[PDB]
Design a protein around this ligand. Sequence first.
Ligand SMILES: O=C1CC(CN(Cc2ccccc2)C2CC2)=NC(=O)N1
Length: 161
Amino acid sequence: GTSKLKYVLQDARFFLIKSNNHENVSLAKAKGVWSTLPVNEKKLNLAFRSARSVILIFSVRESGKFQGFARLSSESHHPIHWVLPAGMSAKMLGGVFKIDWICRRELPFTKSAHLTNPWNEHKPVKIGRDGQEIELECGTQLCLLFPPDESIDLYQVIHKM
Ligand SMILES: O=C1CC(CN(Cc2ccccc2)C2CC2)=NC(=O)N1
């Protein structure tokens, strides 16, 4: 069903998080961690303190899809073998956020064409810079479009709220 998912998403905040490649999403899915540049680190840390749930919705650049979504379980904290763009050092990252995956299934952008994000001029929700906040209603409907991930049990995540 969808009821535990809706409960986790109640009064949540949502952020569009880009990845430079699939490998970093794979690492994040395996290890339950993510890192960012300091600008988005500050934004996500403020959000983590503000809301019962902060949801990261991931999209690998140029993939035309979202690769899943996860809930922050921690503020950032200060090596993980991330695959970084040429010229970027690990020292340019902020701290590491712990995350609990809610859905590891993909959703193509074609399936979210009917959702617009008020915090990005009501452009389609797939459009946004890395770190763009997605308004509650749009973000909830976007998460509900993903195929159910029957491998995940949200019992444990509800307890962290
Ligand atoms: O475009 C991105 C990609 C990305 C993946 N990073 C490396 C990186 C961080 C910031 C910019 C470019 C690459 C691995 C998880 C530590 N994390 C983001 O937060 N935004």
